Amino acid sequence: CKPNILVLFYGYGSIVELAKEIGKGAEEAGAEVKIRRVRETLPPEFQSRIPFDKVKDIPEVTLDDMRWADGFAIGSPTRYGNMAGGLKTFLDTTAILWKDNVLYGKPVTFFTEASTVHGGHETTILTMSTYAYHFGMIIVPIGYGIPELFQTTTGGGPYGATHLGSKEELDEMERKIARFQGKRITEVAKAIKC
């Protein structure tokens, strides 16, 4: 008995390394992992500078990936305390999955990142989590499971793994915390499944 973890994310920066690090932790805990991204929604003018080169290997998410999953790791870089327009759009397309209660009972964990110290590390996850209540999905926080969560001065908190700053490079603390989120969501996904 092995859970299917879907690591879903919007973004092209440090959120990509966060998604891969979560999936790494989920694999080491013993789970089938699929890392998927959402379609871009910003008008054409914004899309010219978007670095698709570092995400060309990561496939676009289908609704079949949602059905395939026993557990979810949904993420987005903060956009003023909320998830990005890209991810929100895709979550709006899951209306058929809602009418049929496909995702009901399945666990979900949330991850984000912000440029400044307190610019959407906690609130973004709390606002994202409203989605879980409507779908009947159990929210899985990481809390203070590993010592690194007490010790971190950069990214990551009880609400979920994060990244501090604009650059795409995760430090040691942020990597340990992200992998732990992979573990925690696997453990709960295994409990509900098996």
Restricting to residues 143-182, name those near its own copies by CB under 8 A: 143-145, 149-150, 152-159, 162, 164
CA distance 190 to 194: 6
Tokens describing residue 116: 């400044």
Out of 127, 148, 168, 171, the residue judged to bind its own copies by CB under 8 A? 127
CA distance 94 to 68: 14
Contact flag: residue 44 with its own copies (CB under 8 A): no
- For CA atoms 185, 56, 174, 113, give the dihedral sign: negative
Contact flag: residue 50 with its own copies (CB under 8 A): no
Contact flag: residue 75 with its own copies (CB under 8 A): no
Contact flag: residue 111 with its own copies (CB under 8 A): no
Query: Minimum distance between the CB of residue 34 and its own copies, rounded to whole angstroms?
Result: 20
Query: Minimum distance between the CB of residue 88 and its own copies, rounded to whole angstroms?
Result: 4
Nearer CB in complex with its own copies: 57/92: 92
Strand, coil or helix: what is 181? helix
Query: Minimum distance between the CB of residue 22 and its own copies, rounded to whole angstroms?
Result: 16
Q: Are 188 and 71 in contact (CB under 8 A)?
A: yes
Q: Are 148 and 173 in contact (CB under 8 A)?
A: yes
Tokens describing residue 66: 């949602």
Contact flag: residue 120 with its own copies (CB under 8 A): yes
Contact flag: residue 135 with its own copies (CB under 8 A): yes
Query: Minimum distance between the CB of residue 101 and its own copies, rounded to whole angstroms?
Result: 7
φ, ψ (nearest 5 deg) of residue 37? -120, 165
